Symmetry: C4
């Protein structure tokens, strides 16, 4: 959120491109923003705002905002403290932090920071190794398993191909693949008491099947435009998906959230909470832990401002706002 | 209306930005104009135009045009004569002038200019002080209380933050805050016989509740894009709101009105009248009282021209025009 | 149709602006083109094209194309031969030519060129003088009275105001105003056996009333964007109007026709024929009579090409084509 | 697919324009791309991808991808090996190749390359010569007759007119016209056992009549924007056409396909397969046979990538994907 310039200044171009890029022609990356910009909120007036609160309860825990840090791999690419800097700032802000399967600091180290860590799973070739990663995350105190379900394999990121981009030798997968199926979801659900959250759902019937499968939540998402190029933005499917699950699981959304007003739009369309990816990495690149803290404080102020201006004393009230496309 | 250049020439940049700016990304500021530009009128032909009149009756009084000067705070920012220059030109044009709570000349001085002064209220922390301001306005001969209902607090105007903009010491609140609620509306309605007009309504159910609450009018408005960034333009809610109140109160609109054709569009969508904000301040900056007089004469000619070209001998006929979105 | 550059090269700027301009912000001028560009034809294949003909019968006479030259005042502004050059080229092409009330050569001189002259009427202050002009036109052999019904007064053409544009002394109204009403239409209809064609109809109920009033035709038109700024383009009202009159009169359209493909679009939306204004004046400015001849030959080839490519052996078949908005 | 630059580098400008251009204002050429860009796919997740296959069965034969090389005349314009280079690369990729009536190498030479040759027919003035060409194609082992039905005559390609473009003397119609009708279709169908595929259908009723006429397939197509300027893109008619024929023939589409994601969009809208024209010629110009091979390998990888990311193990599954317009 205007820290993007600072991050472009400091990062090597090919790392900036790894962060910023999408797959193919980047149509789905651009559409995430276009779709949000077409949504207008219809605010309410003259309601009691004596106790405006941005807090929510999600997956058994209070969060300070309806927002979590999205899983983004290899955060030491952006700053030497990598995941620890981001997790510390998230903890201090009361925001859940999603630890990656491909984190550049081990999941146990990040969980020891405290806060509310979730763990994002990629399915390994091996049910047994997959479930061992889930068990590690649970043993370390992670509070939810965010199972990424839109990466049978990685999308074609043409910026990275044009750059011949590769992991610097000083960045590794500190926790150390086969396509996940509904059978994999069931194996995870049977082996943990943590809520299983399926990230990357766009079809209404997949959202309904996720509830039937025992998911505790879904993230309506086209993976920041990095997977199928031409995949619909999650924000365009969110309202239909929220209606189809009719309260059967938490429904989160991501893709393009860049302000507290955008958070308000997502909640007015029915989201329980959003994920935020690239902006958190911009803040990390620009100023480390303190950069991420400042970003989360700015987003917190913007969310409180937008809610009150729209007559909403709580996130639940914001979910009852109506919208109009423009 | 092309006086904007002259105003940019003369004003200090940070004052020009205070006037021109909106909140956040300015999406709602831009949308006010985009929304008007999508409306096309379907004109009628061959009707009697022997006595074309732009006059309306509103809040017990004749007005020369279906237009009033919007409340804009601190008009000495734009010209040394500030509010007195604008109120004199409005009086001479037969246009109501809305005196601000944050006027830079006292409300009694502006009311003494004559004309048809309305008074815009911000709710004070203190029902008693709020009602004393209403009583001052009524004692001074103001004809309507325009209660602003979309500012529980001021929006985030990033131009002003980037400029570190502050009131020059030579500008003060010459009449000298807590969020207004429906209880505040009732307190005002019980304490005045003047029509109470709620400015900043966008939701249909808030317009219906305003009628139920005893409002004499509403202004369908997103506050010139200065409050919630992402709030729908008033012009996009106007037709639905006019249908929902079904004549129970006057329905005004503002945001982006820049020509007599725009006034015609608003009336064809059902508005009783419009407010005009920034253009009046451009005229004031460019040429003081005579600048505002010339602006109002130009708008008067454009409204008469547009009405007649659309076959409308009266504003009521213009409200029966149909429109098409393009 | 790419002769516009040549015309801009040769004409004085203020005359070019008189020709090219619209009223107000020119929104309706631009919308005439935008609206045509959104229409796509659904062509038919494999039909018999052995005898493709672009001819139509209109107002009792065969025309070589479904097109007439629109009334454009003061054509000596564009070329020394003015109206005679255009009328000669129209005659030779088999296209009707509309003589203006404000022609710069007398209506009797232009009618003597031959061809199929129509006469465009502006209502004079005086029913008697108005009807005398109609009688002159009929005596001279004009075949239709094109009564302009969208000019109670002239629109505000800001290019001309900025230019301080006035008629050169070498251009006069060689045939030598009060707002026309439905009473005026009836006076004309009672005083001529020629078909009366009302030019400037946009509302469906005005098209139905025109049939009830005894009009032989209407021109669905916003006057090339020169009258009400913000008036809907005629092409956007054409289909609804054609359905409402259900064959009760001829329905023509104008505004922005710049190719034979555009003629095909208008006919697929239901027009009996189009008028063409500015392009004919470009051709006249660029190369006089021979310029207009070349323009009409190009339009004739483009209309025949478009019809055949869309599977239409006749203009009637083209009116049965379907369209899709894009 | 980014080989377009290389082709522009090497080809003479007027040959590049012959390849790239459309008719008229090129509205239909541009719309082919705009229309695809508005389509978003709704991908499915968590399905079995153990045996993803891009193969289809069409006109009695397996094809490696749901794609064929479109008929493009005079390929020696782009490279000295012309049609033989393209047909060899198509054969090696398992893609059908459409031999043109106006090929610059004889149809028997191209068919002898092997692979799966189809033959595109233009109707000759002479049923007997037309049917002799069909018999030549069948005798040579072509597997389908692609009867072009949208060229009663060639469209007006203004780039070629402005260039005064003509065939170099070193390029000839190595196989050596009157408008085709439904009678011509029947003559072809009665004289061959090969499937007859009507290329250039856009109207729903023409697609239904094609099935009734005994066509084995249709290509929903506006001829790459080269025939009627203003013709709807095929991709905008495809879904309605697929529903109307309800499995009665194969339904192909072309126009603007530039990636495997675009192939996925076409199949999600119901196409059995696509044709690809200009990109194959870019590859041929840039690098001959090996250029076309590399293009087809890239398209094959992109189609497999897009299918799997959208949860589709087969092309049939991709046809059951839903889409949303954006
Ligand atoms: C560099 C980068 C790496 C990853 C790695 C992962 C990952 O190992 N697992 C996963 O499940 N999602 C990922 N993502 C998607 C992310 O979690 C959000 O879906 C989008 O970034 C939301 O959009 P923005 O807020 O970024 O627009 C990534 C996004 C970016 C930019
Ligand atoms: C500098 C500036 C100050 C104020 C202060 C106030 C205010 O103390 N009370 C209120 O109730 N409305 C205000 N407004 C909104 C105004 O009354 C109109 O809502 C919009 O200006 C209509 O849009 P434009 O005609 O300007 O597009 C302002 C608008 C501008 C530009
Ligand atoms: C310079 C100029 C003068 C006139 C004078 C007249 C007029 O004395 N009577 C009338 O009834 N219509 C007029 N018109 C409108 C014209 O008849 C067509 O309605 C539009 O030009 C159609 O649009 P284009 O083909 O020009 O887009 C004019 C148009 C132009 C440009
Ligand atoms: C230079 C050029 C020549 C021809 C000659 C023919 C032809 O003798 N017969 C036919 O039946 N279609 C043709 N076409 C259309 C082609 O078959 C495809 O319909 C479009 O090229 C699809 O669009 P793109 O993939 O090109 O967008 C051509 C296209 C181009 C560009
Ligand atoms: O999932 C991703 O989007 C991503 O960019 C990525 C790249 C490498 C490893 C893991 C994730
Ligand atoms: O209400 C407003 O929009 C506004 O700009 C303002 C700013 C300072 C004081 C009062 C109003
Ligand atoms: O009718 C017109 O549009 C027009 O431009 C005009 C101007 C002067 C005289 C007559 C018509
Ligand atoms: O069919 C075509 O589009 C085309 O361009 C063409 C041109 C010359 C000969 C054959 C086809
Ligand atoms: Mg996001
Ligand atoms: Mg306004
Ligand atoms: Mg026209
Ligand atoms: Mg194609």
């Amino acid at each position: 959120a205007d820290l993007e310039r600072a991050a472009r200044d400091v990062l090597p171009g090919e790392i900036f491109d790894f962060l910023a890029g999408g797959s193919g022609t980047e149509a789905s990356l651009v559409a995430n923003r276009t779709a949000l910009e077409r949504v207008f909120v219809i605010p309410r007036m003259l309601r009691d705002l004596t106790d405006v609160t941005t807090e929510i309860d999600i997956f058994g825990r209070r969060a300070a905002l309806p927002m979590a840090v999205a899983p983004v791999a290899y955060q030491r690419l952006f700053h030497p403290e990598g995941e620890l800097a981001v997790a510390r700032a998230a903890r201090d802000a009361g925001v859940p932090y999603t630890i990656c399967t491909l984190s550049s600091v081990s999941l146990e180290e990040i969980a020891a920071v405290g806060g509310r860590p979730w763990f994002q799973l990629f399915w390994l070739r091996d049910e047994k190794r997959s479930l061992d990663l889930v068990r590690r995350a649970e043993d370390a105190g992670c509070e939810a398993i965010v199972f990424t379900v839109d990466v049978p394999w990685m999308g074609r990121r043409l910026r990275d191909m044009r750059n011949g981009f590769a992991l610097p030798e000083w960045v590794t997968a500190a926790n150390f693949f086969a396509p996940a199926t509904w059978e994999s979801v069931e194996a995870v659900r049977a082996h943990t008491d943590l809520p299983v959250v399926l990230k990357g759902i766009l079809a209404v019937e997949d959202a309904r099947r996720a509830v039937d499968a025992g998911a505790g939540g879904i993230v309506v998402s086209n993976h920041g435009g990095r997977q199928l190029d031409g995949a619909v933005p999650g924000i365009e499917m969110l309202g239909e998906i929220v209606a189809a699950v009719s309260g059967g699981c938490e429904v989160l959304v991501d893709g393009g959230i860049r302000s507290g007003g955008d958070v308000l739009k997502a909640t007015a369309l029915g989201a329980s909470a959003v994920l935020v990816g690239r902006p958190v990495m911009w803040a990390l690149a620009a100023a480390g832990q303190d950069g991420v803290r400042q970003l989360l404080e700015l987003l917190a102020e913007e969310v409180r401002d937008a809610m009150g201006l729209a007559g909403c004393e709580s996130v639940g009230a914001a979910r009852r706002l109506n919208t109009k496309l423009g």
